[PDB]
Each structure stands twice: as structure tokens, then as C-alpha cells.
Design an enzyme around this catalytic site. Sequence first.
Site, mmCIF file in Angstrom:
data_model
loop_
_atom_site.group_PDB
_atom_site.id
_atom_site.type_symbol
_atom_site.label_atom_id
_atom_site.label_comp_id
_atom_site.label_asym_id
_atom_site.label_seq_id
_atom_site.Cartn_x
_atom_site.Cartn_y
_atom_site.Cartn_z
ATOM 1 N N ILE A 107 0.800 -1.185 0.000
ATOM 2 C CA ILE A 107 0.000 0.000 0.000
ATOM 3 C C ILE A 107 0.845 1.252 0.000
ATOM 4 O O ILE A 107 0.483 2.253 -0.588
ATOM 5 C CB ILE A 107 -0.872 0.039 1.263
ATOM 6 C CG1 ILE A 107 -1.942 -1.026 1.215
ATOM 7 C CG2 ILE A 107 -1.546 1.392 1.406
ATOM 8 C CD1 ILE A 107 -2.670 -1.124 2.541
ATOM 9 N N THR A 134 5.141 2.914 0.662
ATOM 10 C CA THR A 134 6.585 2.709 0.813
ATOM 11 C C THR A 134 7.270 3.946 1.380
ATOM 12 O O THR A 134 6.851 5.073 1.116
ATOM 13 C CB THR A 134 7.265 2.331 -0.525
ATOM 14 O OG1 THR A 134 6.441 1.412 -1.252
ATOM 15 C CG2 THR A 134 8.624 1.686 -0.269
ATOM 16 N N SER A 190 11.269 5.745 3.036
ATOM 17 C CA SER A 190 10.985 6.265 4.379
ATOM 18 C C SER A 190 10.916 5.130 5.399
ATOM 19 O O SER A 190 11.630 4.134 5.256
ATOM 20 C CB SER A 190 9.718 7.133 4.409
ATOM 21 O OG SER A 190 9.954 8.361 5.071
ATOM 22 N N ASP A 250 -0.505 12.844 16.836
ATOM 23 C CA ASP A 250 -0.717 14.199 16.383
ATOM 24 C C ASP A 250 -1.837 14.298 15.364
ATOM 25 O O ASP A 250 -2.003 13.424 14.503
ATOM 26 C CB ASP A 250 0.584 14.876 15.924
ATOM 27 C CG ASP A 250 1.044 14.405 14.577
ATOM 28 O OD1 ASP A 250 0.168 13.996 13.777
ATOM 29 O OD2 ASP A 250 2.279 14.455 14.315
HETATM 30 C C1 LIG Z 1 2.756 4.534 6.779
HETATM 31 C C2 LIG Z 1 1.248 4.422 6.909
HETATM 32 O O1 LIG Z 1 0.857 4.302 8.258
HETATM 33 C C3 LIG Z 1 -0.498 3.941 8.599
HETATM 34 C C4 LIG Z 1 -1.327 3.278 7.657
HETATM 35 C C5 LIG Z 1 -2.673 2.956 8.016
HETATM 36 C C6 LIG Z 1 -3.509 2.307 7.079
HETATM 37 C C7 LIG Z 1 -3.630 2.853 5.792
HETATM 38 C C8 LIG Z 1 -4.456 2.181 4.864
HETATM 39 C C9 LIG Z 1 -4.638 2.671 3.581
HETATM 40 C C10 LIG Z 1 -5.552 2.296 2.603
HETATM 41 C C11 LIG Z 1 -5.493 2.963 1.420
HETATM 42 C C12 LIG Z 1 -6.465 2.698 0.235
HETATM 43 N N1 LIG Z 1 -6.090 1.553 -0.650
HETATM 44 C C13 LIG Z 1 -7.179 0.604 -0.644
HETATM 45 C C14 LIG Z 1 -5.921 2.073 -2.017
HETATM 46 C C15 LIG Z 1 -4.519 3.968 1.294
HETATM 47 S S1 LIG Z 1 -3.781 3.939 2.840
HETATM 48 C C16 LIG Z 1 -5.127 0.986 5.278
HETATM 49 N N2 LIG Z 1 -4.986 0.489 6.514
HETATM 50 C C17 LIG Z 1 -4.196 1.110 7.430
HETATM 51 N N3 LIG Z 1 -4.076 0.545 8.765
HETATM 52 C C18 LIG Z 1 -3.160 3.280 9.294
HETATM 53 C C19 LIG Z 1 -2.323 3.917 10.230
HETATM 54 C C20 LIG Z 1 -1.001 4.252 9.880
HETATM 55 C C21 LIG Z 1 -0.139 4.924 10.865
HETATM 56 N N4 LIG Z 1 1.188 5.360 10.473
HETATM 57 O O2 LIG Z 1 -0.549 5.100 11.975
HETATM 58 C C22 LIG Z 1 0.506 5.449 6.073
HETATM 59 C C23 LIG Z 1 0.197 6.707 6.628
HETATM 60 C C24 LIG Z 1 -0.498 7.681 5.879
HETATM 61 C C25 LIG Z 1 -0.866 7.386 4.552
HETATM 62 C C26 LIG Z 1 -0.521 6.111 3.974
HETATM 63 C C27 LIG Z 1 0.161 5.154 4.726
HETATM 64 C C28 LIG Z 1 0.460 3.801 4.084
HETATM 65 F F1 LIG Z 1 0.106 3.906 2.819
HETATM 66 F F2 LIG Z 1 1.760 3.438 4.150
HETATM 67 F F3 LIG Z 1 -0.248 2.814 4.700
#
Ligand SMILES: C[C@@H](Oc1cc(-c2cc(-c3cc(CN(C)C)cs3)cnc2N)ccc1C(N)=O)c1ccccc1C(F)(F)F
Length: 253
Positions: free
Chosen positions: A12, A14, A16, A132
Site C-alpha cells: 500500500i 513505501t 521512508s 498528532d
Molecule cells: C505509513 C502508513 O501508516 C499507517 C497506515 C494505516 C492504514 C492505511 C491504509 C490505507 C488504505 C489505502 C487505500 N487503498 C485501498 C488504495 C490507502 S492507505 C489501510 N490500513 C491502514 N491501517 C493506518 C495507520 C497508519 C499509521 N502510520 O498510523 C501510512 C500513513 C499515511 C498514509 C498512507 C500510509 C500507508 F500507505 F503506508 F499505509
Amino acid sequence: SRAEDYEVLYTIGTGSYGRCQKIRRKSDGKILVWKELDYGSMTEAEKQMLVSEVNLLRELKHPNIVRYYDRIIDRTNTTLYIVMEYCEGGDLASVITKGTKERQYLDEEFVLRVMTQLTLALKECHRRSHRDLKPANVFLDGKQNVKLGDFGLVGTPYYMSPEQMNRNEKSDIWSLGCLLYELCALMPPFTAFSQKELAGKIREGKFRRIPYRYSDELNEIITRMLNLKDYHRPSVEEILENPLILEHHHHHH
Ligand SMILES: C[C@@H](Oc1cc(-c2cc(-c3cc(CN(C)C)cs3)cnc2N)ccc1C(N)=O)c1ccccc1C(F)(F)F
């Protein structure tokens, strides 16, 4: 509690940091995700710190906090896996960005959801005393639930509170103030090119009203969270007593 227990569906995100993948638990087929982190190049301290953080995530259980499930160690590849619930709707930053592109504002009902469930995220966090409040650290599941992630637990600091900006739970209200305002307006309440310009605007305390599609009631509350004086901002409690906020705006299983 071994990487062998889950199957990777696909990636999903990368970094970093490392990498985030959608995975499936083999025992039952539950869809989850896990964060990948290669600790091979870290000192002993950094690794004790990392272990220190991970013990925190295991402690918080709350419907509006992204749920920790498991932590997997693979000493073979020096890879750490943090397994969490899948939030199918993504982060709020993407939603805001999507909103910006196709020029479509979001429904007041959606703002009210985010306002409500995140205020309850705060209330939980203040109690255990953190994370945050910014769009990137806010996630949506498949059930209209809204969840706060673990971020914080080069760029302009758009959400900096007047007091910080300087030398407080009320500072968090301001940040939440900025986040809902951005959800409504599709832009932060104060924008600038340098931090110094930013700082100057925030000390002035003026911004546009959110779009007119949003009720005076919504505007008034967001506006109150952006009050220059910390003590004039509504607490978590005055926020929830607001007539706008109803049962169906809360989390649901
Ligand atoms: C680094 C990462 O951290 C977290 C991710 C999640 C989290 C994100 C998602 C996502 C789903 C989709 C849609 N897809 C179907 C196209 C895009 S992102 C799904 N489940 C998850 N648990 C939740 C929490 C965190 C966290 N750091 O607390 C993150 C952070 C922001 C945006 C994207 C991400 C990614 F992509 F790496 F997960």
C-alpha cells in the site's frame, strides 16, 4: 506470531519508514495490514527506543484509535512487522486532496463524523497522560468510522498553535480546529510560503469562513477552536455537548 501466519496480498505504501502492506491472517482470513521496518542498521539504543514505542501501541485500545494486533520479529532479515487493522478508506489527507482535484466539497455529515470521533480520540489520549492531529494521521475504515494513527507518538507547520508557536490540551483543540477547517475549506486556515509569514498570520487570527454550504453552527464551533486564547477554545466536553453532534456521528461495529 510469525510472518508465516499471514499472507501478503500487496503493498500500500513505501518509505521512508519502510513499507505498508495489505495482508490476510491465515487462521481465519481476516484482512489486516502491517508496517515493515528493517532494524538491521540501528544501534542498541535506537532499538531499545523502538521496542519502547511498540509497547505503547499495545496499550491503547479504543474504537477511534487505529488498532494494534501483533508485532512480528524476523531476525533473519532484521525486519520488524507491526500488524494493525485495515482502514479501507485511507487517510484524510488523500480525501482532502481528492476533494481539491475534482472540486467537490465534502458533506457536513462527514465533517461531523470526523469532528465527533476524533474529539473522542483526544479525550482518550488526554486521559492516558501524544499522537498528532493532521490529515495524514487520520484513517477511515469500511464502516464510516474515523481513526487516529500513530504519527508523532522541511514543511510549513500549518497547524501550530499560537502558544506553541511559542514556548496544553487546549493546543490540541486548535490543531483539531485546523483539521476540520481544512476538511471543510479544502485548505488550511492560515497559509503562507515561509514559517515566519505563517507565524505572522496566526498571531493575527483571521481566516475565511468555511464555505457557505456548511451551517452557521459548524462554522461557529470550528471558529471557536481557532480562538487565539487557549482558554476560549471549547474543551473536549463542550465540543461533545454541541447540538450538532448526534449518536449516528459516533463509531459503529
Ligand atoms: C505509513 C502508513 O501508516 C499507517 C497506515 C494505516 C492504514 C492505511 C491504509 C490505507 C488504505 C489505502 C487505500 N487503498 C485501498 C488504495 C490507502 S492507505 C489501510 N490500513 C491502514 N491501517 C493506518 C495507520 C497508519 C499509521 N502510520 O498510523 C501510512 C500513513 C499515511 C498514509 C498512507 C500510509 C500507508 F500507505 F503506508 F499505509
